Design a protein around this ligand. Structure first.
Ligand code: PC1
Ligand code: PC1
Ligand code: PC1
Ligand code: PC1
Ligand code: PTY
Ligand code: PTY
Ligand code: PTY
Ligand code: CLR
Ligand code: CLR
Ligand code: CLR
Ligand code: CLR
Ligand code: CLR
Ligand code: CLR
Ligand code: CLR
Ligand code: CLR
Ligand code: CLR
Lengths: 350, 150, 39, 203, 150, 150, 150, 51, 150
């Protein structure tokens, strides 16, 4: 074993304690029930004020909206993550940067989509996710030139490594943005898994399961969604990350798969995914496959907190708080639309 | 009479017993404790049951202490080179066997405690594996006693 | 001889001090500076 | 891994040199030169005794500091959102420092057994003085290394305990038992060092 | 008419026989325990069936103990350098063969239990591979006995 | 008459022939078992056909055992230093050649079973590659016999 | 009468008591300054309060300087091996104790400056931990004062 | 060691003073504390050499 | 007349000739087997045509075996120190030349088989490069035979 116990706290111990303290503030099942019992968005804020969230929503206008609540939750998480990153050192700094690459991918996809449609990049900036902000000025004032934007990404963005999967800037106008996004995400997930493995120790032990499940769920959902589309099997198989546990012949069977029944047969070989697919009834009124995978992801991120001397705590906390913000936004949506029947679809955490 | 340097190896035998058995017990207790503390936020009622691997690591420390006391009581400034070597070997045996058993107990106890938080049925399996790892230190103590008494 | 008693004592003392200094230099070289500052 | 590469290279080179040197000495019939007797004997007992005292104190302090930083980082990090950690979990620090207290106690006990010889010939120095130096060195090694490992172990367990307390107050009282068990190892090392230097007499 | 440092090699043989065998058994037990804990969350019923690797590593440790006690009882004050070297060779042989077998058992048991959670049929194949890994340590024991009872 | 340290190199030859061959066979068995467990998830019927790597890895340990037993029998009180060198060289040759062959068998068998999980026609090629990686241990055994029997 | 090299160990003890204490205090100062710089961008009013860990690292350096000055003023031409090695032991004690205490002070202060920036109440807790970290080096100095004047 | 301390502290301080002008005095004090380590080394060196 | 330790370097020459050649051949075989396993999934009918790198590594091992057996047949009790050094040099030359040749064969064979899975024309280039790597072991054999027969 790497014996991280000896040296982890030299640099990252204070942040380990800090992130665990932050995780202790994620709403529990009782708090989720209390928020569910509300009647209006104002009452939602009122109940939420008793949790760790506090007065994050007191300043904003009395006529609360789901949009306002969602933006405030996003802003709070961005602030906390930015504080942790600012107080992090080299290895944990790279870990947190890898966490942010996920949103930087979507942001660059937005940038290229707007540019190919001749829209100002500066005017596209506000829609980008805060955690993936392109503070670099090389990819700004591009004059709506896709070639200039590709060069800017390559020169002054951490995505230059993932953009070597493509062959040239003509690929931006050639390939569909979804395929670009998913190729970028495959490369990013593979690099993230490699980095975690190189870190080794408790970090690898507690983090590789999460990335592996991410890869497997990406494979499953890409297969299930590309059935009725023009996305050929050959071009689909290029989008499966190789980190998952399906790499030997599992991804191959999925690539050859031509129906949800075949996808389920492939998933059967792995019991962990077998249960998720069995519970994913997919008919109206019961948990869908995406919801089952969300439950499994939350479970894995929670188990990430049973290890101690590892960076996986930060990724798990970021994902758990993302899920919590999604849950609160969903509860606010149910309150606003008066659809109390489905108000229990939120995936609980802790 | 015997060589002036003879007692060096018996001294190092007692020291090696104590130091290496202490290393093993310390690692076992540290790993098991960092497992127990992390788990207990999730399953607070399992702490007392999960304390057992810590006790096994302490037992490794006890074996090391026993052999070290034997050597330090049987060690004199004029002990034959033969007896000094015997005590060096007994010390190395107990210390390194306890080191291995402590590493094994730390790993097994941490993993088993985390699993028991998730799977209560695994407690007995964890206890079996911990006994099997503790029997290694017991073997080391047996060999150390044979050597030191011989 | 290759070594004498004085050389042996000095070498062992210098070896212990080299171990201590290597531990200290390792812990110093492991020092890292922050790459970002809070807004 | 540059520094680890340097250490590994030094280790491999040194032990390859030792292997070939031993093969040469044995095979060339020059074993009589490899006089471990002469080494242990000419090498002054004062070197062993004072290295032992220095190790007894220094390694105990090293373990105490290791554990103190390991657990204080966690205490202070957790206390940003739950300051009660600072007031309650000082017991882990107390244990980590009791390690160093044992270290100084055993340094005193070992140093109390020192005395000059006024001799240089090994036959004049005698078994009593040679064994005294060796046993003081061994007791220093025992106490220092046992205290080092016990301090590191208590520090790891105390960081775990502080992190667990940051989330639920009623857990530290049950997790302190692991700290007590880890502390017992330093006491064992002290007892063994005392037994070693029980019948030790330089002069 | 024999050196008084002759027993040093035999004592190191006994100490190594116990120590290295214990380290290999500890690696096997630790890895197999981690595997059992990981696989027990989902498939609790397989814990006892899957405890086999720990038993095999314990048998490796027992090989080491057997040879160590044989050497310890064969030791003597006037042990010729020849017999001392024989016992050192037997101790190294058993200890390091058991160490290699313990590494093999650790890896194979981890993989086997983790797979048998997924593939029930893999149990017998894992047992066969573990039998081969144990046979390695058995070979080491045979050589150690031949060397130590000349 | 003859140097008293010759038996040390003889027993070093024996213990090396055993230990390094055991380490090579252990690595081969561990890698092959990891591969077998990985591949059997989807293709259980090949669990037994994919055990040839482990048998071919155990053959290396059998080579090492043969040489170790030969050396241990040839050992005696008055072996010339030249005969002790012969035995040490035979042991080193068999042990390290078997260690290399075990590395090669482990890697080749792991890759071969993983591939055969997807392409049945690769089994014969894997068998031939394993034979080519086993003849290395065979050559080591031949050289060890030529040195020892001399 | 006494060896011409007897003063080497005392000189090296003084040099060590200075150098290792200086390295420990330098690590403490560097880590604490990193923490203070990171914190100050948002809480400028806490710089003076948070400069304490730097002062305690300086105190470690002062202990080192004191013991080095004692040994350097005690060195003499006819310094016997007894006094020389007593001073070597005192120097090692002070140097390594100050090294470890400085490491602990640096780490704890870097943690606690940032912590107090967020939570004002953590200042007293940080001070409490730091005083223990410093008295570790103080214990080293105490043993040095016992030894160099034995 | 004092050079290591001064490098780390001064780099951090000069980079953080671009953000907070009030950190200049803190950086200066920490650098003084780092320099006194070299001064202690010099004091012991003088005591020894001029002995 | 001749020193009693002359044959040590001759036995080391034989052992090195076999061991390093076997290590090189084993590395080549492992790399080529990994390449073949990777390629065979998509292009299975090329396995037999692609087995060539393993054959080249086997030829390197055969070079090593030839030199080792030659040295073991030219090794006598009254072996002059000059002839012992000649045999040690021949063994090292062939062994390390074969080790380098096996490394080259492994890398080139892996790359060439992976490429030929996509570009059929690359087969002849791979054969040429493998021959160019083989001639390195051939030169090592030449030098070793010259030294041994001198
Ligand atoms: C690379 C990292 C940095 C280095 C860190 C490690 C440093 C290791 C410390 C080296 C000192 C070793 C002790 C030297 C004295 C013993 C020498 C000896 O046995 O020979 C003299 C002994 C005794 O000699 P003697 O007693 O007959 O000589 C008369 C006595 N004197 C000389 C004192 C007057 O045997 C011989 O005569 C052998 C002659 C041949 C020399 C063989 C030496 C072995 C090493 C040679 C190869 C190098 C190995 C490294 C390989 C490459 C790297 C992996
Ligand atoms: C604060 C700690 C910092 C880190 C540690 C660094 C400390 C280095 C101290 C100097 C080296 C001392 C080594 C041990 C010898 C001590 C002296 C002694 O007792 O000898 C008396 C002895 C007394 O002799 P004797 O009586 O024992 O010998 C028997 C009699 N005769 C000699 C006739 C056979 O004499 C000597 O001076 C022995 C020679 C020792 C030479 C050792 C070589 C050291 C090389 C220095 C390091 C390399 C420098 C280059 C670096 C390159 C750039 C990085
Ligand atoms: C792969 C690595 C390359 C192999 C070589 C490694 C480097 C080793 C060379 C180190 C430099 C030393 C050269 C000789 C120096 C002069 C020594 C001398 O005077 O000798 C007197 C010594 C000692 O004295 P003596 O024995 O000659 O005198 C008689 C002494 N009585 C009466 C007691 C018996 O003996 C010799 O004459 C030795 C001659 C040959 C020495 C050659 C070096 C020995 C080490 C060789 C390598 C060992 C491993 C071999 C296997 C490796 C396989 C990977
Ligand atoms: C890497 C991990 C550590 C293990 C390897 C290194 C171990 C030793 C390193 C320390 C320095 C060298 C120590 C030996 C010094 C020489 C002692 C001496 O001459 O006296 C011998 C003594 C006495 O020699 P003697 O000449 O007095 O002979 C006795 C003669 N009468 C009885 C008349 C007095 O006897 C021995 O031969 C003891 C065996 C030990 C010496 C050989 C050391 C072996 C080093 C490792 C290589 C092993 C070869 C096989 C390789 C494969 C291994 C699996
Ligand atoms: C540049 C930086 C500053 C300078 C470097 C300082 C730090 C490095 C120094 C550390 C020691 C390195 C060298 C070790 C040599 C090992 C033994 C060599 C064998 C040898 O030939 O020694 C014989 C004596 O040795 C004996 O009698 C055997 C004693 C062996 C004891 C070894 C213990 C220490 C090393 C290994 C353990 C390390 C852990 C700490 C204990 C010589 O015989 P002669 O002809 O001179 O004899 C004269 C009367 N017969
Ligand atoms: C492997 C091939 C065969 C090698 C055989 C020869 C012997 C080994 C020599 C080294 C061989 C490999 C080359 C390594 C070069 C040195 C180590 C890496 C570079 C280095 O030292 O720089 C940084 C440390 O700073 C420094 O430069 C500080 C180093 C100086 C300190 C000197 C004090 C130690 C004295 C030795 C005695 C202690 C013994 C302890 C066991 C480390 O960089 P990084 O890893 O942070 O960055 C990653 C890249 N560098
Ligand atoms: C496969 C890997 C290799 C395994 C093989 C073992 C390797 C061990 C390495 C150590 C060296 C080999 C041991 C045997 C050689 C001992 C020296 C013999 C040379 C000799 O004649 O010295 C006698 C003194 O030795 C003595 O009386 C010394 C007795 C003690 C020897 C053993 C000590 C080794 C160091 C152990 C440290 C363990 C540390 C544990 C943490 C002479 O003396 P004399 O009385 O005839 O003087 C007459 C003066 N006029
Ligand atoms: C099992 C561990 C924890 C120790 C607790 C039991 C103690 C009291 C037992 C266990 C093994 C015992 C030793 C076993 C062997 C012998 C040899 C015999 O001729 C005299 C007594 C002596 C030296 C025994 C002393 C007491 C002993 C150490
Ligand atoms: C007591 C519990 C822990 C069971 C484990 C047994 C251990 C600790 C003890 C108890 C009795 C002991 C034996 C009692 C008597 C002797 C005879 C002596 O000449 C050599 C040691 C030897 C052979 C002891 C070996 C170790 C031993 C078996
Ligand atoms: C269950 C307990 C006994 C531990 C398991 C290992 C047992 C079976 C081992 C450990 C040491 C072994 C003994 C060691 C030495 C000898 C001397 C030999 O000439 C006959 C066998 C005999 C008497 C062995 C019998 C088996 C033995 C007692
Ligand atoms: C399949 C079974 C037989 C293997 C397990 C038992 C092994 C360890 C036993 C069975 C018979 C034993 C052999 C029987 C008799 C002797 C003669 C003695 O002078 C040296 C040891 C030697 C050569 C034994 C070595 C170990 C041995 C091979
Ligand atoms: C499953 C396979 C590997 C088993 C085959 C093992 C073979 C290679 C072994 C088993 C016993 C061995 C023989 C045992 C003894 C001798 C006598 C010796 O003077 C020459 C070699 C020779 C004749 C050996 C040759 C190799 C040998 C036949
Ligand atoms: C697993 C099995 C099938 C593989 C073969 C292993 C057995 C049969 C091997 C291993 C060691 C071998 C022995 C090694 C040495 C000798 C001494 C020689 O003068 C006669 C043959 C004899 C006695 C061999 C007989 C066969 C032997 C016992
Ligand atoms: C035929 C191929 C497959 C090789 C398999 C057998 C090998 C490993 C063994 C079995 C019997 C062995 C032979 C048995 C006896 C001798 C006599 C001796 O003075 C020189 C070596 C020599 C000539 C051996 C060479 C290697 C040998 C042929
Ligand atoms: C397929 C592999 C095993 C081929 C091995 C290489 C063969 C061709 C080599 C290796 C050692 C060689 C032998 C070495 C020594 C002698 C003795 C000499 O007086 C006649 C030739 C003879 C008998 C050689 C014949 C060829 C030989 C057997
Ligand atoms: C496979 C082949 C090409 C590689 C070996 C090259 C051949 C041609 C070389 C290698 C070593 C050489 C031998 C080395 C030494 C001697 C001794 C001399 O008095 C007569 C020639 C003779 C007997 C040489 C003949 C040619 C030789 C056998």
């Amino acid at each position: 074993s790497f014996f991280p116990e000896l040296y982890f706290n030299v640099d990252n111990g204070y942040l380990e304690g800090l992130v665990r303290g932050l995780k202790a503030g994620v709403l529990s099942q009782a708090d989720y029930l209390n928020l569910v019992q509300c009647e209006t968005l104002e009452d939602l804020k009122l109940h939420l004020q008793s949790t760790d969230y506090g007065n994050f929503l007191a300043n904003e206008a009395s006529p609360l909206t789901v949009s306002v609540i969602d933006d405030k939750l996003k802003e709070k998480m961005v602030v906390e993550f930015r504080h942790m990153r600012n107080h992090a050192y080299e290895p944990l700094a790279s870990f947190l940067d890898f966490i942010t690459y996920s949103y930087m991918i979507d942001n660059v996809i937005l940038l290229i989509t707007g540019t190919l449609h001749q829209r100002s990049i500066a005017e596209l900036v506000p829609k980008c996710h805060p955690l993936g902000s392109f503070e670099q000025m090389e990819a700004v004032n591009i004059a709506q030139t896709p070639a200039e934007l590709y060069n800017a990404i390559l020169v002054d963005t951490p995505l230059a490594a993932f953009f070597q999967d493509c062959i040239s800037e003509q690929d931006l106008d050639e390939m569909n943005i979804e395929i670009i996004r998913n190729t970028l995400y495959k490369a990013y997930l593979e690099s993230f898994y490699k980095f975690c493995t190189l870190l080794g120790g408790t970090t690898a032990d507690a983090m590789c399961p999460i990335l592996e499940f991410e890869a497997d769920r990406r494979a499953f959902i890409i297969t299930i969604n590309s059935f009725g589309t023009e996305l050929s099997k050959e071009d689909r198989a290029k989008l499966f990350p190789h980190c998952g546990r399906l790499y030997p012949e599992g991804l191959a069977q999925l690539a050859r798969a031509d129906d949800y029944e075949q996808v389920k047969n492939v998933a059967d070989y792995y019991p962990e995914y077998k249960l998720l697919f069995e519970g994913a009834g997919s008919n109206p009124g019961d948990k869908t496959l995406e919801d089952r995978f969300f439950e499994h992801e939350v479970k894995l991120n929670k188990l990430a907190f049973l290890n101690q001397f590892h960076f996986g705590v930060f990724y798990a906390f970021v994902k758990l708080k993302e899920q919590e913000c999604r849950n609160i936004v969903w509860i606010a949506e149910c309150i606003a639309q008066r659809h109390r029947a489905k108000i229990d679809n939120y995936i609980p955490i802790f | 009479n015997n060589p002036e340097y003879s007692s060096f190896f018996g001294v190092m035998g007692a020291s090696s017993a104590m130091v290496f058995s202490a290393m093993g017990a310390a690692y076992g207790t540290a790993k098991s404790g960092t497992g127990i503390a992390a788990m207990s936020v999730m399953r607070p009622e399992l702490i007392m049951k999960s304390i057992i691997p810590v006790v096994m690591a302490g037992i490794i420390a006890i074996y090391g202490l026993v052999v070290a006391v034997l050597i330090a009581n049987s060690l004199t400034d004029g002990i034959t080179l033969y007896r000094s070597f015997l005590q060096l070997g007994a010390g190395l045996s107990v210390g390194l066997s306890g080191l291995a058993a402590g590493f094994a107990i730390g790993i097994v106890g941490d993993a088993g405690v985390r699993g028991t938080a998730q799977q209560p049925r695994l407690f007995v399996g964890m206890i079996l594996i911990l006994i099997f790892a503790e029997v290694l230190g017991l073997y080391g103590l047996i060999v150390a006693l044979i050597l030191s008494t011989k | 001889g290759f070594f004498s008693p004085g050389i042996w004592m000095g070498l062992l003392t210098t070896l212990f001090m080299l171990f201590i200094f290597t531990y200290g230099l390792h812990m110093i070289l492991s020092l890292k500076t922050m790459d970002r500052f809070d807004d | 891994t540059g520094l680890e590469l340097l250490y590994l290279g030094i280790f491999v080179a040194f032990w390859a040199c030792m292997i070939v040197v031993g093969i040469c000495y044995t095979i060339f019939d020059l074993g009589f030169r490899f006089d471990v007797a002469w080494f242990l004997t000419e090498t002054s007992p004062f070197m062993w005794s004072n290295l032992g005292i220095g190790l007894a104190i220094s390694l105990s302090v090293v373990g105490a500091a290791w554990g103190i930083y390991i657990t204080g980082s966690s205490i202070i990090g957790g206390g940003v959102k739950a300051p009660r950690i600072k007031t309650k979990n000082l017991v882990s620090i107390i244990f980590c420092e009791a390690v160093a207290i044992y270290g100084i106690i055993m340094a005193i006990v070992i140093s109390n057994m020192a005395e000059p010889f006024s001799a240089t010939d090994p036959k004049a120095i005698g078994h009593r003085n040679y064994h005294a130096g060796y046993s003081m060195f061994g007791a220093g090694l025992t106490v220092g290394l046992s205290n080092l490992f016990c301090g590191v172990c208590v520090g790891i367990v105390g960081s775990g305990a502080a992190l667990a307390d940051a989330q639920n107050p009623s857990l530290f009282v049950k997790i302190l038992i692991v700290e007590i068990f880890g502390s017992a190892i330093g006491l064992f090392g002290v007892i063994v060092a005392i037994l070693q230097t029980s019948r030790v007499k330089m002069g």
